[PDB]
Amino acid sequence: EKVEMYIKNLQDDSYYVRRAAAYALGKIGDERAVEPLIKALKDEDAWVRRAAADALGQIGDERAVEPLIKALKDEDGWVRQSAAVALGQIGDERAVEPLIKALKDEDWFVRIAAAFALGEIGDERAVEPLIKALKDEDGWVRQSAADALGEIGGERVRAAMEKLAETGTGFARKVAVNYLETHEKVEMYIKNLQDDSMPVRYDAADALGKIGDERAVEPLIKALKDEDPNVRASAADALGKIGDERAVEPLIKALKDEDGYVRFSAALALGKIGDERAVEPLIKALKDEDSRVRWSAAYALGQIGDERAVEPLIKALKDEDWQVRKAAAVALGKIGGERVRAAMEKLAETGTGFARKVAVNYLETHKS
Ligand code: NA
């Protein structure tokens, strides 16, 4: 209930309250705040855009990716840097080619952020550009590419480190020689899913989801029954990104978890998967104790597009929570059947307040 003031305060005329919203959404915000924070990225204030990138990466939702890739071409250097670090933290491979370009950014601190990003994604296409980055004019940029080659650490790395220790000059040489003096991936993380330490399990689920390999499905389904709810919810998100339809049934079981964040993550995942069998259980999740879960239920039913949620969403237009209503209105928009039209005209004439207001609007939008 702190979140919704900030979400609304994201479109406020004042540029001082936009900043405090974005700032706070960086600390508190969750998946509900990405579509708004994605819009915040188009602001006039560079502080609002920056803080919005900062938060999108902290939230870590894949929808922020094509937007943050455009924010990499922002006029403000510190907004470019935020966009780079955020793509870093989301771990989506589509950022790699444009993060490589940012590796030659006019500003030193942007190059550092691009190097770090490329390190954290661990895609191998960055190894050569990263190796070329060791000869950058700025020592700190060179140092950041060193650390990013370390993070990736493939055989492509060791290959380039050998060639450099054999042949290179200056810092690049120093780095390669030290590399030698001190010294596939999916399978390591699947094993880490079964680790005793909780952070190792969590990070494993995080990792497998970003990687997106279908190997990880059956082990992540198992992590849905994890001791710890943070791990439980990470494995659900990861299953959502992977998109493998084998998680559908065990995800429907996560819709009845003790933890609200696991339930929330399970529903968002089922909408991404888009399988019809989530419709019934998601409909029953629009009546949840938790206003986040009720939101995710509407959103996912939006993604799925099945007409059996029309009236449960109409009902959801009168939810106590503001943005659950907003989500249900969006969802009826996506579905958009001949059914939805007829429901909306009834609601135009007989509705009250918010539900009436969006029933009127829907009808205005769908005319030509
Ligand atoms: Na900022």
Domain boundary among 184, 204, 220: 184
Are residues 159 and 203 located together in one domain of the fold? no
The alpha carbon of 262 and the centre of ligand 1 are apart by a number of angstroms equal to 30
Closest CA to 283 of 264, 301, 270: 301
Are 38 and 67 contacting, i.e. CB atoms less than 8 angstroms apart? yes
Domain boundary among 164, 184, 204: 184
Q: Which method, experimentally, gave rise to this model? A: X-ray
Are residues 363 and 238 located together in one domain of the fold? yes
The alpha carbon of 101 and the centre of ligand 1 are apart by a number of angstroms equal to 23
Are residues 213 and 261 located together in one domain of the fold? yes
Please count the structural domains in the chain. Answer: 2
Are 302 and 293 contacting, i.e. CB atoms less than 8 angstroms apart? no
The alpha carbon of 48 and the centre of ligand 1 are apart by a number of angstroms equal to 7
Structure-block tokens of residue 250 = 């065990």
Are residues 209 and 330 located together in one domain of the fold? yes
Are residues 241 and 165 located together in one domain of the fold? no
Are residues 263 and 301 located together in one domain of the fold? yes
Report CA torsion sign: 193, 94, 91, 244: negative
Are residues 298 and 365 located together in one domain of the fold? yes
The alpha carbon of 82 and the centre of ligand 1 are apart by a number of angstroms equal to 8
Are residues 239 and 342 located together in one domain of the fold? yes
Q: Would you list the DSSP string of 203-239?
A: HHHHHHHHHT-GGGHHHHHHHTT-SSHHHHHHHHHHH
Structure-block tokens of residue 177 = 């020689």
Domain that holds residue 247: 185-368
Are residues 169 and 190 located together in one domain of the fold? no
Which residue is listed with tokens 């080619």? 97
Are residues 210 and 166 located together in one domain of the fold? no
Residue 337 backbone class (left: φ over 0; alpha: ψ -120 to 50; beta: rest): beta
Give the H/E segment covering residue 353: none
CA distance linking residue 282 with residue 271, whole number of Å: 9
Are residues 215 and 108 located together in one domain of the fold? no
Are residues 222 and 236 located together in one domain of the fold? yes
Burial-class residue 65 by CB neighbours within 10 Å (0-12, 13-18, 19+). middle
CA distance linking residue 111 with residue 146, whole number of Å: 13
The alpha carbon of 112 and the centre of ligand 1 are apart by a number of angstroms equal to 17
Kindly provide the resolution of this structure in angstroms, with one decimal: 2.8
Domain boundary among 127, 162, 184: 184
Burial-class residue 107 by CB neighbours within 10 Å (0-12, 13-18, 19+). middle
The alpha carbon of 73 and the centre of ligand 1 are apart by a number of angstroms equal to 17
The alpha carbon of 52 and the centre of ligand 1 are apart by a number of angstroms equal to 8
